[PDB]
Write a protein that binds this ligand. Structure first.
Ligand SMILES: [Cu+2]
Length: 128
């Protein structure tokens, strides 16, 4: 499964990876996120967002201020490189983005923007 990754958000507020790797070769990269467990959207909801390590906190803060009705993310947030939808147990989501967006010298992070979550649920993304 080149140019893509299979990542899970669970009931204990953890992704199963903190380091994701993007093959330089890919024009596009796709992230398939799922949520093993039994806790629902309003209780243990997860989403995957991508941004530079520097923009992460503004993205989490304004996301948080973007309610559960907007999937806890400022719609059309410019610092958001890519993002999945917010999901609960049993559900799945996927997203594909343009590798060209990943620029050089940049530090990228992925993180869940549900309140209380981003601290634990985060890892780096590196264009190798
Ligand atoms: Cu989460």
């Amino acid at each position: 499964a080149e140019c893509s990754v299979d990542i899970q958000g669970n009931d204990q507020m953890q992704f199963n990876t903190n380091a994701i790797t993007v093959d330089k070769s890919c024009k596009q990269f796709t992230v398939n996120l799922s949520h093993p467990g039994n806790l629902p959207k309003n209780v243990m909801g997860h989403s995957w967002v991508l941004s530079t390590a520097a923009d992460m906190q503004g993205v989490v803060t304004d996301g948080m201020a973007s309610g559960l009705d907007k999937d806890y993310l400022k719609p059309d947030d410019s610092r958001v490189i890519a993002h999945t939808k917010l999901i609960g147990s049993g559900e799945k989501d996927s997203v594909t983005f343009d590798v060209s967006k990943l620029k050089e010298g940049e530090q990228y992070m992925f993180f869940c923007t549900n309140p209380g979550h981003s601290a634990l649920m985060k890892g780096t993304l590196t264009l190798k």
